[model samples]
Target chain A: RLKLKEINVVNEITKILTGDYTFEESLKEVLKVLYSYLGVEHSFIAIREGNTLRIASSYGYFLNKDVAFKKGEGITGKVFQRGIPLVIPNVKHNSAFANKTGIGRLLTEKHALIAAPIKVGGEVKGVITIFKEFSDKESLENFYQTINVIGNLLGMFFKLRE
Target chain B: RLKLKEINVVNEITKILTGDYTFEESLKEVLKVLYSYLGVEHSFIAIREGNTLRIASSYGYFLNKDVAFKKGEGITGKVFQRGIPLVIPNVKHNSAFANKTGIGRLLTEKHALIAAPIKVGGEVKGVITIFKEFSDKESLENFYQTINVIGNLLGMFFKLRE
Candidate 1:
């Protein structure tokens, strides 16, 4: 059963997506809600352009670092390429996980990461990735599910604007 | 200073507006937030078309009664016609107020109604009205300010969508 708090968070997120703001503006606002309600420390949306996935919008990280990945290159790209969602309990232990964003603070901490493909018309258009402190198995699973739902909802936003 | 609760309510309303949802869909969700946070029992948006202002969207009232008004006809139309915000301390005491939506239960109860013009490009396009229990002067004034802010913010949504 969804708790009231969770339902409110989801509804608020839906409100943000539908609020008729520009994509960047909406995502920036969504990042605030994610931090306030879910304790998400870092998040970004990377839109696929040609063969490279480029960071389009982000929070909790500097954008000057040129965060880009080839198709299937990193956790973010793999999600986009495969059109699947992923959860990393600890990035330090995962070889497939590349810490390309170069945030040393994130590397030193026990942060879990989740990535989901943003799709339009059943095809992947982008990927959304988020980071939070590592949690228990069930909590991480729940987070993955919620992020996936957000990813799908975001797909609709993209579809409508196109 | 605005309280944290009030800020969240406003942000949630903005999100509903910008979320790419239809006007009716956004207003329906906004009504739930208004009731949950401010105890606003009923709310509606009426758009001005030619000489008449008609209820375009509403919550907490049945819409079959054909609520419409000529320019400056009622409190709602006055807000639209004059581009002003109005607060009726108690609808029962205000002869100028017309509870045309008929919800007789509303007339019997001590309810205050506030209406603000929804503008686009600095011109009045519609009016947003809400009903809540009567309160002290200070509290009622605060409601008027918040509703006006919402009306202005909604103006941007209409501007962008067009």
Candidate 2:
């Protein structure tokens, strides 16, 4: 049986998807909900634009806008390359993510990180990544499936706009 | 571990609620999702307008348009009278229900029924009701809390509209 708290969250998010909400509006609200429910310090959606993955929406407003990534570029780029989830429990240790266009500057120190590729018909559509203050791998294990669901649902809009 | 199907539903609903969805659009989508998730044929929201309960929105056609009930008059009205849930696993035997304007006609034969008051502060604000074919009382046991969440979210909108 699903817990009441979890069910309540599901109700709120589903209402948005089936409603006629715009992509940006949906992502903005989704990022906020993810923040509140999982205590993720940063949550964002990056869409595939041409050959670049661009920052489309985010809860971490401090990051410079117009961030873009090549398919083999950053950790997010790596997810695009592999088409799977990337769990970065320790950030500084991963050389592929080192500095990373000031992402290292934003989440400077330890943090738990998880990101999944949003896909459609075996093609990579986008990426959704979340970061929390402490670097404990298990805190977000409970919500990993939920992030992928959001990724796919939001992927529909991304694919449509492509 | 959380189920993927349940996680997908939650993601969909929360994204829509947080997105910039029109109230009616959101309500229509929410009820349909609820109907499928819980196997209820009919699901709807009723709002409190002064001493009257108005049918604010629903699924299964705009069939219940302009439907209203007086406070303390029926199952929904009684919810306004006393803030509590009314769960009827079997409907053919229930008396508070015998619908007029053919809500009964639409309902047809025996079914499962449940309704509950949505509150803001200490006052009863509105009631949400649902019906499903076949009477397996335990089928919706997990969803009881979900209906309440829908009721309250829609209830807040009802208050703001007044």
Candidate 3:
């Protein structure tokens, strides 16, 4: 069974996307919903630009430096390249993880990370990455699935934006 | 000073309206923000068309009847006619409080009612009505101001929709 918070997130996101908003506005609102419901500290969308991914929108994270990634360069790029969702048990221990958003320095305690590809026309167009506290196995899986659904919805929205 | 929750409500509503949505979708999201921040139990928007006011969008309350009001018909219409907001401390005691939305029966405890006009081109276009538990005089005035701002924002949205 889905938890109440998950269901609330779904409800709010569905309502939010129903509105006509710019890509940035929609992504920010969607991320705010995630922040409010899931208690994530940092989340962002990295949009594909030709060969590199660029930060398009974000929540709880600031772009102090130029943050871009080539295909398979970092966790974000790897997800975009593979078109698959990933849940990193501990980003601090992952060699592929790049602390590009400066969110790493904000965490004094252990944390988990997750990323999913945003697609349009069955092709990856962007990635949504989140930094959150660790969850138990089952709930972590559930969170992954929930975020994957969000990714797919974002895909449909992207297709519609074209 | 505005409360933290009120600030959050302002932040969320500003983000929500920045999106492209139909009036109904926009109003629903705005009301959702109100419910989350203010603990409003029942709220609705009565739209003006020709000489009658009709429920255009709502949250927490269901429309059970052809709840339309002519100019100066009930509390909603009074605000519509006056182009000013009003806060009723106890709807149960007000003779002009026409319980069209059937919200009165749902309130067993003392409750407050508030309404503000949604204007377009300096003319009243609609009214946003809310029902909630009675608040202190100062906070009630603050809530009135917050809702009045929302009504103005809704008016702007309605204008742009045309």
Candidate 4:
């Protein structure tokens, strides 16, 4: 069964998206809701541009630099390239992880991370990522599904924006 | 050009109102928007219930008490009774004001107050009142106009709820 918090998040996001909020505004609220309810430490979203990814909206991280990733270059890029969800239970132990953009420095103290692509029309447009210091596999999967729903909503928002 | 701050509030409120929101939920957003943009320190909304006013929503004030009023008894009542906006630039100097409610104490600490009846079908069905520490007559008037527009939008929400 979905937790009451999860249900509330679904309802709140639905209400917010149905309102006339812009893509960015809705994105921020979605991240906030996740951070608040799911007890995640940080969340960020990045959109694919050409062959690289660019930060679209982020929370709980310093904004000193613009991080970008090529296809399969980092965990974020891997999901965007493969159009699948990626969850790193321990970033310290993941060999496939590449921290080239210095963005991983913020997560060095954190353990778990989930990255989900926001796809529309069968093409990946963006990715939503959540990070935490500690989280069980089940909790991570729950968040993954929640973000997938958010990604779908965001996909619809992008289509409407275009 | 609209002030950057006011424009943001209008955009936020408009987005929420246009979205799929319950009447009470949308009114909560309206109160928040007013608190942020209009420098309102505290606010309350009351809808007419039979022959008396009942609190419908509120923020930033005592919440445990049953704060109601009959028409023409208090500031809100007077707004409902007179069908005109009340702008008390300095409640300390307003002799016609009644101090029956604890709102008088709030006004003494916060020297400015503005109240306007929320009308539907040419009849006052509710009132939106806000209190502030100090505001010029023009600023208060501007807030009145802004909230009046919001209240009209809220009336539509209430009508839809009905």
Candidate 5:
């Protein structure tokens, strides 16, 4: 059961991405929509850079000082390596997750996390992850799908630029 | 002898019109360049309409109450009809000039005016006009030549769009 709010968010995202806004403007708007739709306190999008991931956009948090990571170094890196979605319903109990001060603090305070790889044409271009301390599984699943749609749209748009 | 500043403006206009900027943005930047270089208090570039003209890019002026003329109706129309550059060194002394209050006031307030037909493929496609209150004949001639260069560049860019 998709909430009305989620539906509106998806519509808004489509309107923004497909409209006349510039690429950077559209990307920032997408991040804001994803954060609001998932009811998350913070979100970050990181693009794969050779063997490292670089933060491209961030909201409700300052990750400017920390921007790079090797493949599989953190939860985000794992998604980059495997090119798959990962849902840490309870990050505190997930031993496979490498704890970083910024991400660990977010997990301890939020207790929920969702990370999805952004792939296009069979290649992983980037990853989008949302952190929410309290949210239902249904909302998480809905957010996962929403991010996937955004990733697909971005792929198409960027491909046009190429 | 063109100054480096003028050359820079021409180069910038070329980049904007030829690069990936949107149509509206490119037009606006071109208008700004004309305004700055020609010392025009008000200016507009208009496309031909059957026997009239439609404003395309305007700066430092109002459209609704300030403009409208048919082919051969006013100075602009005369230039359009002949497909030649028209220079009114002093509008107050030109008998062929139309005495619309809006244009009259602008000319009186400014002193000199030049309207150059923008022709593509030997056909008049539009007009670029600039007005100034205190410019010598030689400088105005230089300005006219620069505008011709701009018109040629714009025509080539528009063709590329097609």
Candidate 6:
């Protein structure tokens, strides 16, 4: 039997996909779900709109501010180019975009980031980036399945919007 | 935007509905999700058969023990009788089924109970009951939409099984 936490993760993600939720609204709601259930502090969907990525929806981060990272500009941008998932176990060790995931708890506090490319028709369409408080590498890696599945769905939904 | 709690609740419930999860497995996984996200101590679906309601799927509280109540036997049965949703702000104050929701928690602790009839084709099929930790009457009642929708789906599923 799966642990309570894993089962809960699968359950909530399943529920979001079942509803008649709009694309942007679904991502925002889904990120909010991640915030409470998975301790995610920052969640964003960056869809490629020509040269620069466009922030479609975000939660648990600066509401007013949005990110538009061009291909290979930063972690999220890199993931968009690579079309693979990346997990950063320690946020503080990385010097680039140190302010990328401001959790409002502590400036010096270490955080972790997980990003996956949203692909459609064998091409990267966008990126889904999520951040959480720092944790062990193994635990963060364990969440790969959830992030990848959600990322693929987000990509498909975004493609359908166009 | 949906609350993190609601998003989590809705996500897990939807996933179970969409995934090829067995009825019993779905409810068990759903209860586990509720236990972590909503602090639900006991969650169960009781299907109607003739004049009696029997547990169909459940999680939290003890296993091996199931509840069965004739129509109008208690709050759950009464819900079946009326074919409507009911919310109790304080479970302890209700004389009927005071012990039904206990999860080894303190008896003095305030608990809330929410129940909605599962209906299909205008016929009451079953009842879904969920218990939670202390909360104001306003929020608990506000959950009517979620519970009502989920309950209807459960009713349809139960109706199919019958």
**Over all chains combined, what TM-score does candidate 4 have?**
0.47
Query: Residues B12-32, candidate 6, lDDT per residue (tens digit)?
Result: 554454445676886678667
DockQ of each: 0.03, 0.06, 0.02, 0.02, 0.01, 0.03
DockQ of 2: 0.06
Model 2 lDDT vs. the true structure?
0.63
Question: Per-residue lDDT tens digits of candidate 1, residues B64-110?
Answer: 44688888787887888887688888776688886676664555456
True contacts kept of 5: 0.00
In the range A1-162, model 1's lDDT, one tens digit per residue, is 333344445546655665667878877787778778887778888887887788888878744456887778878878878887788887666788777876645554477889987766457888889988764767776567567656755665665466
Could you tell which candidate, 1 or 3, scores higher by lDDT? 3
Candidate 4 local lDDT, A93-123, one digit each (tens): 6787776544566666446877877665546
Look at candidate 5 and give me any clashing residue pairs. Answer: A110-A133, B110-B133
In model 2, state the lDDT of residue A43.
69
Write down the lDDT of every candidate, Cα atoms only: 0.71, 0.63, 0.72, 0.66, 0.63, 0.65
Candidate 2 structure quality by residue, lDDT tens digits, A1-162: 324445445445545543446778877877777766656667678878777788888887424566777787778888877777777766756776744555665665676567788765446778888776654555456556555655654554443333
lDDT of 4 by residue, B15-71 (tens): 565466677776777787777775666788888887688778887773555677788
Report the candidate with higher TM-score, 1 versus 4.
1
lDDT of 2 at A57: 84
| Tens-place lDDT digits, model 3, residues B38-137 | 7877888889998789988778755444578788888998999888778887776678899876678887446888998877645788899998876476
Clashing pairs in 3: A20-B20, A21-B20
- Give candidate 3 misplaced runs (Cα > 4 Å): A1-162, B63-65
Q: Candidate 3 residues A1-162, lDDT tens each?
A: 345576456545644554567767988998988988888778888888897888888777553345788888878888988887788876767777787666777764457788988766457888888878764655676577557656755654565465
